[PDB]
Design a protein around this ligand. Structure first.
Ligand SMILES: [Ca+2]
Ligand code: NA
Lengths: 281, 64
């Protein structure tokens, strides 16, 4: 029997599934450590590796990209978990090696690959404390090209009145996602600041792991793919909506939580996002 | 319970590992280059150490 992880229910993805919309024909690049394409609860459509010493994007020697992928798009069937957008066309864009780290040029090469291959959505459950002009230019170009770009806000927690959102989440063109738990409380590690845009579940998130396994991970890495998967549901229902419109629909229909410094606009609600008329609940 | 080591910035990676393992003997330590991009999962058992090209600590070590 399949299980629906609590976070998929919490963002109201089942409301879209019951309307008949599951992300079909929407191309989502998971820019990450690869995706284990042998997992029976995932279908990987394509991909490419930018990691010079690990040339196979369908081998995930870390586990992180495979977990992120399952939150986006674990298959709707009688096993494992269910993804937010279980019919999405899932692309493994490997830019991190086994050790969980990548050079800026590798991430940029992956973003460029995604643009060149007409991805509709990019998820980047990744980050660092400094930006670069070339990194900003790559995400800006992806957004200018029509791609919805979503990233983890970072796991730096609070630091007085200072922003702790990392890059590329901190760039205006990228939707920075923080983490809440099942009670809608901000996770203590979730980064904070005026760049924090929306929140999604990021505590004890069950998803796919390599070698046909499942497990619960924590992090803004886990929150980000709920929003990338939500973008794919929205596009499957409104295939002509632009990235601008998808982004506004998610921002404009959140459930407001606390102060925006800590919570951004609040918890995404994909049921409300995918209606024509938007307001907060 | 100590979860950040700002006093280790500028020390060798060797001294950092020794100190962190005194405070948190079960720590899973990984050494990575500073100025890279990394996964954004949160692991209470992990301490990443970010080093410069001379193998000195270049960012405050913390749990996560
Ligand atoms: Ca399934
Ligand atoms: Na941003």
């Amino acid at each position: 029997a399949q299980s629906v992880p609590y976070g998929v229910s919490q963002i109201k993805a089942p409301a879209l599934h019951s309307q008949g919309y599951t992300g079909s024909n929407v191309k989502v690049a998971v820019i990450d450590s690869g995706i284990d394409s042998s997992h029976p609860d995932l279908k990987v459509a394509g991909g490419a590796s930018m990691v010079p010493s690990e040339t196979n994007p369908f081998q995930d020697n870390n586990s992180h990209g495979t977990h992120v992928a399952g939150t986006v798009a674990a298959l709707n069937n009688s096993i494992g978990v269910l993804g937010v957008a279980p019919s999405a066309s899932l692309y493994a864009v490997k830019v991190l090696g086994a050790d969980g780290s990548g050079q800026y040029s590798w991430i940029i090469n992956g973003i460029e690959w995604a643009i060149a291959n007409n991805m509709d959505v990019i998820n980047m459950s990744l980050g660092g404390p400094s930006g670069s002009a070339a990194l900003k230019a790559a995400v800006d170009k992806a957004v200018a090209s029509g791609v919805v770009v979503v990233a983890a806000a970072g796991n730096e927690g609070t630091s007085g009145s200072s922003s702790t959102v990392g890059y590329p989440g901190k760039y205006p063109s990228v939707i920075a996602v923080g983490a809440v738990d099942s009670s809608n409380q901000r996770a203590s590690f979730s980064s904070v600041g005026p760049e924090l845009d929306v929140m999604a579940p990021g505590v004890s998130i069950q998803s796919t792991l390599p070698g046909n396994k499942y497990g619960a991970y924590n992090g803004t890495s886990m929150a980000s793919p709920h929003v990338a998967g939500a973008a794919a549901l929205i596009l499957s229902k409104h295939p002509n909506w632009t990235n601008t419109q998808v982004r506004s629909s998610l921002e404009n229909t959140t459930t407001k939580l606390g102060d925006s410094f800590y919570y951004g606009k609040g918890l995404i609600n994909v049921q409300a996002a995918a209606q024509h008329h938007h307001h907060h609940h | 319970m100590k979860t950040e080591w700002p006093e280790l910035v500028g020390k060798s990676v060797e001294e950092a590992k020794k100190v962190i393992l005194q405070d948190k003997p079960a720590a899973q330590i990984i050494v990575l280059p500073v100025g890279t991009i990394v996964t954004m999962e949160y692991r209470i058992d992990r301490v990443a150490l970010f080093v410069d090209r001379l193998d000195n600590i270049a960012q405050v070590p913390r749990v996560g």
